[PDB]
Amino acid sequence: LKDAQEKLELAEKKATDAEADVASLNRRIQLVEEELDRAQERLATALQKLE
Amino acid sequence: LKDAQEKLELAEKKATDAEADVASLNRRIQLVEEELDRAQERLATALQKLE
Numbered sequence: 001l002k003d004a005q006e007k008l009e010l011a012e013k014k015a016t017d018a019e020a021d022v023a024s025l026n027r028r029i030q031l032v033e034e035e036l037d038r039a040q041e042r043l044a045t046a047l048q049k050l051e
Numbered sequence: 052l053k054d055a056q057e058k059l060e061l062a063e064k065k066a067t068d069a070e071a072d073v074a075s076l077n078r079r080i081q082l083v084e085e086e087l088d089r090a091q092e093r094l095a096t097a098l099q100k101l102e
Contacts, residue, residue, distance in 0.1 A: 001052050001055065004052045004055030004056055004059070005055055007055070007059045008055050008058050008059050008062065011058075011059050011062035011063050011066060012058075012062050014062070014066045015063075015065045015066035018066050018069030018070050018072075018073060019065075019069050021069070021073050022069050022072040022076060025072075025073060025076035025077055025080060026076055028076075029076055029079050029083065032080060032083045032084060032087060033083055035087055036083055036086055036087045036090060039087055039090035039094060042090075042094055043090055043093045043094055043097065046094060046097035047097060049101065050097055050100045050101060
């Protein structure tokens with residue numbers, strides 16, 4: 001039981017950290033997508049003014 | 052020990068799933084980052100053309 005509970009603890013800690021990493025990466029994805037959309041809009045406006 | 056092993060299996064499956072999510076989300080992060088880099092390079096070229 002000592003080994004089994006130690007394995008349980010390590011697996012649970014790893015899964016929780018992985019979930020936190022997933023949430024952080026997803027919010028990073030949405031942030032970077034917003035920045036990309038703003039950059040594309042700026043590019044379009046600049047090209048029109050250039051022409 | 053039986054319950055501990057079952058929870059170990061569940062936790063390791065969930066952690067592997069979240070690790071795959073991490074891999075996918077980091078791939079998306081890098082790809083959108085590259086697209087944003089291209090967009091900002093285009094923006095810099097556009098400002099140069101404005102000048």
